[PDB]
Symmetry: D2
Subunit: 124 residues, 4 copies
């Protein structure tokens, strides 16, 4: 993958969450996510995909991943997907927007989904 080395490693967002990911040559993303906020403790499994043959015109590398918020400690009956792009360089970044859906009854489904945006850096 073009940015396999760039993406693999430990990333941190503006909330202090820790995103540990391995990018595979086939376009796979695997790793763990630890949220500094919310109904969460310790690490959760994540899995996703990235464009392993991105454009060479300076564009970023599109990618996404999911965490379901169940582990051996807690279950928040919810999942978040981050959709974004990796931007290489001296200050590499993964810029994302995300959707956090909670399991609800049908009557509460209108209020089932939060939206936000996280920026991940290699430092902090």
């Amino acid at each position: 993958g073009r940015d396999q080395a760039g993406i693999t490693g430990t990333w941190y967002n503006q909330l202090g969450s820790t995103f540990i990911v391995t990018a595979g040559a086939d376009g796979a993303l695997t790793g763990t996510y630890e949220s500094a906020v919310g109904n969460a403790e310790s690490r959760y499994v994540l899995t996703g995909r990235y464009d392993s043959a991105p454009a060479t015109d300076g564009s970023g590398t599109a990618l996404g991943w999911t965490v379901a918020w169940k582990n051996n400690y807690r279950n928040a009956h919810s999942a978040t997907t981050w959709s974004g792009q990796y931007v290489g360089g001296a200050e590499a970044r993964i810029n994302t927007q995300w959707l956090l859906t909670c399991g609800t009854t049908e009557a509460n489904a209108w209020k089932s989904t939060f939206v936000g945006h996280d920026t991940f850096t290699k430092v902090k």
Copy 2:
């Protein structure tokens, strides 16, 4: 997984896209996605996660998955994440919202992400 059997199988959305998924006992989602629209042809790898121990109060089961839009035929330099919940019953549904991020230059990053909503059913 509580809804492992309910989720596993072939699903179709309102656009005619085909979502083929296997839910693992560990919370994994694997399979393929074929979009009826956009810069896409044939099947693409997907991976995601679901809550394998959902609440028993009638709430849905939270889940998400990602497709990076590269396969052996095309590369649209983009990825979509769907975030949603599975609702069991006679007319089972996966109700989602999604984020499609395209790789862009930094100057175009403000217009990098589409948002929408797909409903998947076992029929059609």
Copy 3:
């Protein structure tokens, strides 16, 4: 406005909410919104804008509006914006996606915004 007559009137969404709007020749939208769900009762002021000279190629008419959820009865310290398009015809529709932001502390701002989608029809 091309769709001034089409847009003006009373609309209803899938939740049973009532959207009463007047489209002005200048592109203004004014009216009231009554939500069937949430921390809301009775009517709330809304204001927005629409494209008063849409394309003539069959495309919909882009529009948006805001409700702040304060009236003489309640204040939910939140606002929703709907962004969408009006589609004319025998079964006219306003198809929207929306963002509901609640006032939060800075520590809770990551969970300040819900996202959803409402479809409005002239009937129901």
Copy 4:
């Protein structure tokens, strides 16, 4: 309005766009928007609403507004709604997420809406 004075004035986002707004005592927002990017030139009418009696616990003030991208110079057949909160203090901010819907045919409606996030400050 509690933050009538705080909100009224000229704001700038991270793209260099200019948001000129007057907050009314009744909860109204009026003004003009000039986008530094996209199919836009000069000023466009905006209108919205804000919570004129926010909580006093340190929470932000919820607000939203709409721009339809038609003026005397251009018509981009689209509208954006920003939904967010005003945060007062020495470095006052309006933190938003937004939805930009373009008029499309029904066949293209799945790709009608962009999502993003803008932060507005009194400086820059």
